[PDB]
Enzyme design. Sequence first.
Site, PDB file in Angstrom:
ATOM      1  N   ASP A 143     -45.665 -33.874  10.446  1.00 44.84           N
ATOM      2  CA  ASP A 143     -45.562 -32.599   9.763  1.00 44.84           C
ATOM      3  C   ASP A 143     -44.441 -32.684   8.735  1.00 44.84           C
ATOM      4  O   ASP A 143     -43.515 -33.493   8.851  1.00 44.84           O
ATOM      5  CB  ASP A 143     -45.312 -31.461  10.749  1.00 44.84           C
ATOM      6  CG  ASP A 143     -45.873 -30.140  10.262  1.00 44.84           C
ATOM      7  OD1 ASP A 143     -45.910 -29.927   9.032  1.00 44.84           O
ATOM      8  OD2 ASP A 143     -46.283 -29.319  11.109  1.00 44.84           O
TER       9      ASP A 143
HETATM   10  O1  LIG Z   1     -49.235 -27.157   8.846  1.00 43.54           O
HETATM   11  C1  LIG Z   1     -48.546 -27.975   7.893  1.00 43.54           C
HETATM   12  C2  LIG Z   1     -47.242 -27.282   7.535  1.00 43.54           C
HETATM   13  O2  LIG Z   1     -46.361 -27.384   8.655  1.00 43.54           O
HETATM   14  C3  LIG Z   1     -46.606 -27.922   6.310  1.00 43.54           C
HETATM   15  O3  LIG Z   1     -45.379 -27.253   6.000  1.00 43.54           O
HETATM   16  O4  LIG Z   1     -47.521 -27.802   5.226  1.00 43.54           O
HETATM   17  C4  LIG Z   1     -48.658 -28.635   5.434  1.00 43.54           C
HETATM   18  C5  LIG Z   1     -49.438 -28.212   6.676  1.00 43.54           C
HETATM   19  O5  LIG Z   1     -50.364 -29.258   6.986  1.00 43.54           O
END
Ligand SMILES: O[C@@H]1[C@@H](O)[C@H](O)OC[C@H]1O
Length: 743
Positions: free
Chosen positions: A267
């Site tokens: 993430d």
């Molecule tokens: O859920 C994710 C989020 O945490 C991030 O900040 O942006 C992209 C997404 O895939």
Amino acid sequence: AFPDCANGPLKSNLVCNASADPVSRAKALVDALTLEELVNNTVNASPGVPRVGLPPYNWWSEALHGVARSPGTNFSTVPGSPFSSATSFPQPIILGATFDDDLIHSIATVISTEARAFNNAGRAGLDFFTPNINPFKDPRWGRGQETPGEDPYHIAQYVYQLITGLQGGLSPDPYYKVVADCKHFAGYDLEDWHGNNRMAFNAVISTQDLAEFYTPSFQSCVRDAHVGSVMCSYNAVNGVPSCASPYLLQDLIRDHFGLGDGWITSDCDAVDNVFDPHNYTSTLVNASAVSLKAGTDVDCGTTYSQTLVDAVNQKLVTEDDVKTSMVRLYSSLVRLGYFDSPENQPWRQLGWADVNTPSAQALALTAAEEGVVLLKNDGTLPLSRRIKHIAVVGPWANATTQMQGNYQGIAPFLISPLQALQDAGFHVSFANGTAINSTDTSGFASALMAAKAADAIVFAGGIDETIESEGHDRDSIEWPGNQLDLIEQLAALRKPLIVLQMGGGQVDSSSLKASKAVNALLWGGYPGQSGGTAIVNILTGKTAPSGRLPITQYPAAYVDAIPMTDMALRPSSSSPGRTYKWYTGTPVFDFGFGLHYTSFKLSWAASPPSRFDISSLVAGAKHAGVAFTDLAPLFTFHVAVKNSGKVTSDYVALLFAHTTVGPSPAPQQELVAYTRVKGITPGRTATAALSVTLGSIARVDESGVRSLYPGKYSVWVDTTREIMHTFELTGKTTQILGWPQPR
Ligand SMILES: O[C@@H]1[C@@H](O)[C@H](O)OC[C@H]1O
Ligand SMILES: *[C@@H]1O[C@H](CO)[C@@H](O)[C@H](O)[C@H]1NC(C)=O
Ligand SMILES: *[C@@H]1O[C@H](CO)[C@@H](O)[C@H](O)[C@H]1NC(C)=O
Ligand SMILES: *[C@@H]1O[C@H](CO)[C@@H](O)[C@H](O)[C@H]1NC(C)=O
Ligand SMILES: *[C@@H]1O[C@H](CO)[C@@H](O)[C@H](O)[C@H]1NC(C)=O
Ligand SMILES: *[C@@H]1O[C@H](CO)[C@@H](O)[C@H](O)[C@H]1NC(C)=O
Ligand SMILES: *[C@@H]1O[C@H](CO)[C@@H](O)[C@H](O)[C@H]1NC(C)=O
Ligand SMILES: *[C@@H]1O[C@H](CO)[C@@H](O)[C@H](O)[C@H]1NC(C)=O
């Protein structure tokens, strides 16, 4: 852009050899590069290697419910120009409310086709962060709108269909279509509730609840649908961040669920979060080192590209770990047709003519039509053919961008409920009377003025991104602001009143449910680009309602009975339970609840079995066309669904099961099967095939192991328990699916 495997510098490398093994091609590309070059490519915004002619590539691309805005995607600035828009589908919550696996697969095919068309114009990548399969277990999660619902089995079916549709089949027959990425592997379903930031939140989850709730979706994703990518979440599980947990990333994802040498993205700067604010490591370089060794192959950020060299020098990781992750990434790219000639890739021949196809628009409209749930109706719907003057009122009355939720693209059109009422030839009086969340009554007058002379009032309101979003969990699950007051004043006119409750999460409509002056109530969620037309097709009778509630509408007081930090689903001395299968209270509207314009008579089309030996089932499991025992069948129901009414409609058969055997506690209900019988003309009797597997009937014990237990099981078909059948499992308890213990 793509490399030049015909004339460029890599032409004589085995990576540019289509006949060679994809993993071997990735190995040949990685061995040709420098360790530091490999490191500066271990991030989502990779620059490539200009020396070898390797162009840049941004892995961060978004296409949740259609090609969305993301770092890896741009939309043409000119409004009417090519690639200025893309088919914006309704939110995955309404898509799970459809309960149509064929529809979900076709939508995935449309999304993948348009993503390929955008990539061919240099406007999109080939890997996309989709889907979000975190169960919407707490009613006030801001991103639960991005998910099909709260049932792990329903989300499992959804994600199987969506992964197969996006990637272009159960296998890269030749090449992938696009590489999917099942989102946030952990117990991630919380944003900022009472100050608990996901980036510093420590989710405490029992192994039983871990394997029974939070992971079935990912098991269906990477084991049964064979996804190409997984994303580890921001939060920590039992004190360890996910992207830095070898038990979560290696023991479960790569091994028990069998991701293998697919690539795991972190993430976005969750690796940075491992250091600050997760506090988990003392240095940033150590944070990235633990993330890499745990399984995180690419960082959505800049932590890897400036720390992994120091990590190799400080002996925290080896050069070979970086090379392994880069080989995984480049192997998925090789499978994407990145290094093969465009002459042999039909998916690389797609252009702007394939984006806003009429089939795609009609499919979005059909998804909206199947996803809307009818919660209440006293016969006022379908609207009388004599109704000509309608007053449209509310914060959602003329909704356009609100109709898209989040993680959306620029739609070719946003047909509001007002615009759709006008499209049906209605004399419409519009007034939005109040905002989504405000105490200003100054608009009420207008609303009343618009409705006092109308043949029907259509109040459309609820919640939107102002209430629930990424990084903003809800504090109350009620109608925000003074909307209920305006609905109550409209009900004082005692005209035909129809209330449309929108938004991802549910709001307490019990006051609307109990008031005889409120004639009809629907849930619209985020019905996408063609949402208004679908709602009006349902209202007029052009389309019959057939969707069903994918989540539980909790009463308001629930927010006081359990904290959003409590990750346990079972009830106790401080928990009323979670989801439909453990909640001990009385929900306003149940999971799977839905109404139709016609009446059904449900019976047996074939006398059901009543006895099974567990050992015989396990033995026969090796002979069914499945690769894992839990996918083998237990039996298949044949329900006869007769349309005893006067209107053609689809019916969603929701086979629920309940047992009192195996581990105690045992849930109230559990969705063990569902099918969508489409278009039953009046009088006609259609047959619903409902297949239950051993994995959905087995029970998960404290060890997290899935095993079959003997005793009496009962099964019914609707939330109203239309028909019911009780069978028995006999013999000895047999383990169906093991579970690696926490490391
Ligand atoms: O859920 C994710 C989020 O945490 C991030 O900040 O942006 C992209 C997404 O895939
Ligand atoms: C790919 O490599 C094989 C040997 O492994 C060779 O026979 C073949 O000609 C190569 N293909 C191309 C297009 O160079
Ligand atoms: C590191 O990344 C930068 C891009 O920010 C690039 O200029 C540089 O060449 C990379 N290092 C190596 C060794 O390629
Ligand atoms: C979109 O494409 C144009 C030209 O194709 C490019 O100049 C622009 O930078 C791109 N948008 C983004 C956000 O990169
Ligand atoms: C948290 O950070 C503090 C420094 O502010 C440190 O003393 C402590 O050991 C850390 N604890 C954990 C569990 O990371
Ligand atoms: C409805 O919304 C559209 C787009 O937001 C806007 O152009 C139009 O003026 C609105 N209609 C009314 C009556 O406000
Ligand atoms: C409805 O609200 C929008 C802004 O939320 C506003 O532009 C519009 O004027 C409102 N409708 C009417 C009839 O005023
Ligand atoms: C309405 O807005 C207030 C802030 O002004 C917020 O605290 C509250 O949670 C909102 N109401 C609902 C029901 O979300």
